[PDB]
Amino acid sequence: VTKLQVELDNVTGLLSQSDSKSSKLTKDFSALESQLQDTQELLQEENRQ
Amino acid sequence: VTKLQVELDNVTGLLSQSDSKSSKLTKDFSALESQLQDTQELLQEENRQ
Amino acid sequence: IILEDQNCKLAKEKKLLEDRIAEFTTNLTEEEEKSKSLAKLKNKHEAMI
Amino acid sequence: IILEDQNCKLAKEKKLLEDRIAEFTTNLTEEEEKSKSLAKLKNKHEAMI
């Protein structure tokens, strides 16, 4: 029971760290979306010029 | 002990769900990262052309 | 028509590569999600084993 | 004249897309084996348990 409780804390910490780590990944995913849209618009506008 | 074992399986599922959410962001991260490479690298050719 | 024929077939390559690169990048990250998800679940078996 | 600029742009994009695909597709092979290998690793603990 104590060993399972210790594993529960590690499991809860792993899932919590994964969820918290996912928030930091949103910046990279969101930054790429804004960068991809800006780069795509720059590449598309470059063809017109 | 028997209850914690079954409860551990349910708690472990949340870790996979949290990891899937964090890993899901990495999936689009690699896709956007690869797309940015084709766009960022193409930007250098745009100025050259 | 000859120039458009080449551009038509060549346009599909740029569209297919751009569409395939998104799936290829996600496919590579899919293994990480399954590996990370299985690794997290496997950690519970390691602590139990 | 417009097709020449569009065809030339698609030519560079198609060349960069194929080159970037190999950089990501190559990692998929290692991730595919690692992800699949990790799947059987979890079963080893279950069988051993």
Show Cβ contacts of residue C45 under 8 Å, excluding neighbours closer than 6 positions.
D42, D45, D46, D49
Rounded to whole angstroms, how far apart are CA atoms D22 and C26?
14
Show Cβ contacts of residue D31 under 8 Å, excluding neighbours closer than 6 positions.
C28, C29, C31, C32, C35
Supply angle C-alpha D18, D21, D24, rounded to 5.
160
Contact residues on chain A for B45, CB-CB shorter than 8 A:
none
C-alpha separations of B19 from A7, B33, D42 in Å: 17, 20, 16
Name the helix (H) or strand (E) containing C24. helix C2-48
Tokens standing for B21? Answer: 């959410």
What b/e string do you get for A26-46 counting C-beta neighbours within 10 Å, with b at 16 or more? eebbeebeebbeebeeebeee
Q: Are D20 and B37 in contact (CB under 8 A)?
A: yes
Tokens standing for C14? Answer: 């740029």
Q: Are C33 and B27 in contact (CB under 8 A)?
A: yes
Tokens standing for A44? Answer: 């598309």
Nearest to B22 among A1, A25, A33 (CB): A25
Closest CA to A26 of B23, C49, D35, D1: B23
**In chain C, positions 1-49, which contact chain D (CB-CB < 8 Å)?**
3-4, 6-7, 10-11, 13-14, 17-18, 20-21, 24-25, 27-32, 34-35, 38-39, 41-42, 45-46, 48-49
